[PDB]
Amino acid sequence: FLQKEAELRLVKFLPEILALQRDLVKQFQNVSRVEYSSIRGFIHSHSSDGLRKLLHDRITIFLSTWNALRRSLETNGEIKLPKDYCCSDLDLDAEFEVILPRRQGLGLCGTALVSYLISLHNNMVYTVQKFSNEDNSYSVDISEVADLHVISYEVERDLNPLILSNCQYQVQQGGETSQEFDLEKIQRQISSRFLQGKPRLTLKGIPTLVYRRDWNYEHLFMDIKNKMAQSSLPNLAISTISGQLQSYSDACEALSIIEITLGFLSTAGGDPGMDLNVYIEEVLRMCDQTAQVLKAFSRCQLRHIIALWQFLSAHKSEQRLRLNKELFREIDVQYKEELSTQHQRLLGTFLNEAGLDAFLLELHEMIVLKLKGPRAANSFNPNWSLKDTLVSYMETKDSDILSEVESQFPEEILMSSCISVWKIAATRKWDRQSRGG
Amino acid sequence: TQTGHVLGSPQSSGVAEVSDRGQSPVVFILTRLLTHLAMLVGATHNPQALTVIIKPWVQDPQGFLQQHIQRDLEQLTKMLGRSADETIHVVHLILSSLLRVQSHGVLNFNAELSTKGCRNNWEKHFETLLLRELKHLDKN
Amino acid sequence: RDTVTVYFHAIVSRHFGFNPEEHKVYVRGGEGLGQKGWTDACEMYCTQDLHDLGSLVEGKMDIPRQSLDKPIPYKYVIHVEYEFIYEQAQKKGEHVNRCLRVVSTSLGNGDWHQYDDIICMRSTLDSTRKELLKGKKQAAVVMLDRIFSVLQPWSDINLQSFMTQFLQFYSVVREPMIHDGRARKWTSLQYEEKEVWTNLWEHVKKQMAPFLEGKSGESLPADCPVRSKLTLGLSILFMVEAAEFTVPKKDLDSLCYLLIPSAGSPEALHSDLSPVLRIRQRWRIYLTNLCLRCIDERCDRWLGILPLLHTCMQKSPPKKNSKSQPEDTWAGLEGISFSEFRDKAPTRSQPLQFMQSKMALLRVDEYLFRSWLSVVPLESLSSYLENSIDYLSDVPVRVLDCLQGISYRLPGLRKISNQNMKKDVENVFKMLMHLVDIYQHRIFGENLLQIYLTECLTLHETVCNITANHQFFEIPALSAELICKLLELSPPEKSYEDLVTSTLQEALATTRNWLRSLFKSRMLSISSAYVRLTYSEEMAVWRRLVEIGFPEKHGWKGSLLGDMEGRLKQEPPRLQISFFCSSQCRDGGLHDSVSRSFEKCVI
Amino acid sequence: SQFLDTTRLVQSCVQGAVGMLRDQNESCARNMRRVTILLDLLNEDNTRNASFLRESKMRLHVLLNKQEENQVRSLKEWVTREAANQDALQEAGTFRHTLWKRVQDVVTPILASMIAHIDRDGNLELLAQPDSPAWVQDLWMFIYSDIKFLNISLVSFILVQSHMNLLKDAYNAVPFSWRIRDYLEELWVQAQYITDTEGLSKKFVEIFQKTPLGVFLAQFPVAQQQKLLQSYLKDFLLLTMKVSSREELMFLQMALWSCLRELQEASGTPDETYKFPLSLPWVHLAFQHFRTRLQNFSRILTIHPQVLSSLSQAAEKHSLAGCEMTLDAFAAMACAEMLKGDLLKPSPKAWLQLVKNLSTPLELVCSEGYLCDSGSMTRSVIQEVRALWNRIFSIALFVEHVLLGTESH
């Protein structure tokens, strides 16, 4: 307690800064929609004088406690932050973004402060529990914390008298004045008022705003695979589908419909049965567009949806190949490099003995999910091979044919030219499919 | 990590500079005071080398370390239930007691403080000597 | 806590022969005062000598809170001579005595102020009533003077004490009350609140007069209780508002003169005066109802009340037009219908002269210029822009607010049919280009070029759709000249190139849409064997829209020429040959591109 | 106008709008429910549905009007701009199909944001729930029929957030919970800033009746007004404090109602602010005057889950909460009785942990600072629970001093 009393004295204002964070989160529930340069303009941008003074005193206290605690955050908090935050004494005329509890850029001030406060409170209560109580179940979230639940005291008004009453004077017959601090009475006095009966705080109800736009589609695939026992598409089924979507605008409409239905299914439930027809028509109730796509989806259930999506995506891209149409128009040009004669020769050597149908599909999925253009060399720099990244991406969730792409795939695929391999494979498949009959 | 002398301006209302991961508060305080006065002694010859050593400031080691020492001394006089003269007496006793510690048991540590292990060993021996000499001031 | 402080103020008449040195005064009343009934409850101390009127006397006491909203009988005694009320008792043997009713809701700061009129000694009806009425009038005047003096020094606490004291003063005076068995109004006085506030206004006018003559500070009369003109204006505002009583229209020229921020040009004085007026809610309604009451056919000095209202909100919004809200919020008014005054017969030539007399007021804030932009008549707006050359030279940024204002007012104005506002528009646009190119290119500095480009293109789009007569093409012509000259002035990353490409594309698209829009017909129809254009002055129109110098990497020489060649090709070759040298396609413009295109089409 | 079937457009694009909506991964994801309820309420058969469609039409109109003003008109002239986008043309079949696709993709994010801003906790379910009292739909329409009061912003997977940690199908009884909460909070802030803490109730209620919402609710009859009031206490209690039960929610409901009545009994006989005592602001007033007490009551409800059993008999054997509040006092009484009942049954150490966990709340409730003023019966109750609390605390000290020593040593 005397080790961390200095910072324990400032946990009384944690509800205030937390309420400020809730208000700022609710009032700015967006991304990249901020225009206020300084906090002064933001606070003066309110006609309500009472609300203005509320924000004034709240932000003054927030600034004071942040300045008082901006030393242990770089060394003791469980979140790592750069030193540029605590190097300067922030003022009222400082930048505005700092008061926003983000988690990645310049927003770690409030998050780090509240996390340090809750961490020290939790550590203190945990130590107290493991000292004497040895058991507890009382705990509350940060969504309804009050001034009654936090630990608050004033040294001059409450802490000094309680300890000064526990200074014992002893005198001997010979004449002396010895000072003794009986540990038991002071321990019971301090414990029974401040650090007993307090809840065990958890980090669940933290005021935090969403910074990442959840559009990587990978969490949707994981949610689909975890919620349902997804199954692969039967060969006759996929053959019929490819038969009934030979057009292009048909493929685009199918893409739109399946993307909407996948967006619904990833953030909700779905029975592995209950074929895609009845799911389309009456589960979410959209109107009929074209009988062709419905007749295509008729022979599929929910347990194939993602697989269907991937195949459908490939089909669209594959169509763009036949009509000599620029097939991506979105990806980086650094990957749009032509393979060399030896490269395509080894690629054809692989293609001569390969299950092209699944391989082209998965490789197209890899490009369309990760090779989006900018910000793509972080883990897929155009200097690796394909067998390593393919096996790494497929060992996660795939148990399909693997040995062909690690015992027969080219060892120098030149990832820099990654579209060329799939394009040449698709041309080979199209020639095989069309020129025979 | 974060080597050097990274510290804010002493005129700050922040934390009281509580002890680090593994040191008693009194020993840690005495050790940091001795390190600060050692940096003053070194800077009194070549302030440019210290300017390179300490990261934030570029103007004057002397004034900033003087404010540091003033804060240190006032927190020491707030530390011992003595008089400021008696705090000075205690620090003088501590300083003069480590001169008569000719007993050599300070092996297996580097004399340059270039590694964290040797730095921690130096801190360990410094803690040992500081406690040995602070358990001898009440009766002196 | 259980006691309320009541401050009794009275006047002892000269007929009493009262001497503060020798005679003492007390307030004796029933048990409602908190002391024993009809006993000396509050000692009543003299403060000022009123000469012929008598002696002004003040005192205080503490009454129980249980007495709130209840009638308490009381009278003034002089040490013993009881005060005499010239009223006949309803019940024989009962004493007509003053009634104290402390209003719980009107306590305000917690202290009540009971104002009692001149204390009259019994003279050992109509003439006596008139004399008593005169004495009460003078008493009300002097206590209003005291409430005036309470306002000094200019502080928030003094202002609150002032408003509470004035409320209690009005409540006491407007309804003279007496207590003889039961509290009742003093109807025999016939002192209706009408005459009460007639006397109050006549007293107020003598405080109004000195400031109208230019007196301020030391030059003011030494008996003037209010020293700052703005303070006196706020005081009369508070008094007339709390009573909601009519003001003579002659007195507006005075009361609106008081509120002018004389000797308050720096914003430091207004920021330091803000704490005296911290409440930002009641003052808004007060000032809005003041201006709306002054919106009558005088509307002269009210322009001075805008800065006072405009000194106590947020800072100037730098946002582009059409994004936030219409002119009400941008100018900061939100409560004045300037649309009816900007669009009407401009019989009031005063505002222009007022503005010319108050250049200094334009520096006291930043909302004043934008507010004046949306209120000035359009025909005089060129002179308004001319008068602000110094203001724009001090800060070469207010031209952004000028663009915001014009792009605000222009779409509201109806379609064009006249010649007067033609002169208005050309004059205001020429003053605009003048004030644009004279100063510098620092207007585009600090990365401010993007919003300026957006404002210009929005002005282009919003001014294209008000011209459909092929003779006002000069408005889009100088609009294109304006965008051209603001394109070439900014200093030379690729962001500027992208912005200039997009802006010039939007400009030429808007011009093209306009040219297609007003030309919804054929052209060069013959109908007489003497072929002439259905838009006779169209060719010169083209002539002014092509010479404007734009970067040749862009279009305007491959796009617009294609537009003309598409326009001409529908006409039969014989007809265009006949029109070709019909003495109307004259003016070979020294390798004029349009004449050369005419040549190419004809060959 | 007739230039495009707006109703058809929204009926087609609701699926796209709600498909990208997501809750906090566990807060009753209702995507299929959301689209089903929307299509239930997106027809023209009912006049209520027609009014909803009209209001949605005007809201979409004004939102898009404010939206396109940042465009450079290169997208305002959307037809030609789309046509020049030839890949968009070849992906969308014919030309009219492509125009419809562009319109629906323009409309879908805006409507999704509208659903997110409106369906914060389930406001839509009230309209679809049958036998809904007239005040429900009247207030929902009234709040949905304003601009300044309910201002809607815009912005990928947008987020809709819960405000009360809703249980299974909470469907907040009030048409709008958070908006009314914040509106009344800021009204209280302004009223308390402008005027001192002497006519705080009067100024707050008068500025409540000054707003259009107050004059709207004044037209509601007494029965609907009081049902709306009770639902308002319920939603405010659920929002402010989260309870893991149902009976304790009703206990808090009655406690807050008793506190409100007691506050409405503080003044002797004003007859100017008590002429509309069945009004919304009193709720906030009650909290602002009794929050600590309520908080402590919350604690004594959260610290012991079995005490509710005794509360289960309270109104049955006390008929309490008539004029003033006494539920915290009865909770203290029940806790003291359960202390004095057994004293050894679960375990002496488990007992010691129980009594020490509830030691400090029982100390707080038995404080003169806690009970500033109340009825004399309540004062007698606090004195007797003080006596019983001191007795049980002495027993706890005794056991912790002797039994621990004689069982460990």
Author numbering:
A (entry chain A): 4714 to 5150
B (entry chain A): 4499 to 4638
C (entry chain A): 345 to 423, 432 to 476, 487 to 854, 863 to 973
D (entry chain A): 3472 to 3626, 3637 to 3890
Text taken from the publication that reported this structure:
The giant E3 ubiquitin ligase RNF213 is a conserved component of mammalian cell-autonomous immunity, limiting the replication of bacteria, viruses and parasites. RNF213 is the largest E3 Ub ligase (E3) in the human proteome, combining E3 and AAA (ATPases Associated with diverse Activities) modules into a single ~600 kDa polypeptide. The cryo-EM structure of M. musculus RNF21328 revealed that RNF213 comprises three sub-modules: an N-terminal stalk, a dynein-like AAA core consisting of six ATPase units (only the two units AAA3 and AAA4 can bind and hydrolyze ATP), and a composite E3 module, including a RING domain. Thus, ATP binding to AAA3 and AAA4 subunits is necessary and sufficient to promote the E3 ligase activity of RNF213.
To investigate whether ATPase activity is coupled to E3 activity, we disrupted adenosine-5’-triphosphate (ATP) binding or hydrolysis at the two functional ATPase subunits AAA3 and AAA4 of murine RNF21328. K2387A (WA3) or K2736A (WA4) mutations in the Walker A motifs disrupt ATP binding, whereas isosteric E2449Q (WB3) or E2806Q (WB4) mutations in the Walker B motifs disrupt ATP hydrolysis. Suggestive of O-linked ubiquitination, the Lipid A ubiquitination product was unstable at high pH ( > 10). Together, these data indicate that ATP binding rather than hydrolysis is required to activate the RNF213 E3, regardless of whether the substrate is proteinaceous or non-proteinaceous. Consistent with this, the WB4 mutant underwent robust ABP labeling at ~100-fold reduced ATP levels indicative of sustained RNF213 activation and confirming that ATP hydrolysis counteracts ATP-dependent activation. To enforce an ATP bound state, reasoning this might capture the activated conformation, we determined a structure of the RNF213 WB34 double mutant in the presence of ATP. Structural changes relative to the original ABP-complex were less pronounced (RMSD = 1.57 Å). Although ATP could be modeled into AAA4, AAA3 was empty and once again, there was no clear RZ/Ub density and no clear basis for elevated transthiolating activity. Although we do not elucidate the structural detail of the active site itself, our structure suggests ATP binding induces either long-range allosteric repositioning of the RZ domain, or conformational fine-tuning of the E2-docking CTD, to enable transthiolation from the bound E2~Ub conjugate to the E3 active site. The structural rearrangements that facilitate activation might also be highly transient and recalcitrant to our cryo-EM workflow.
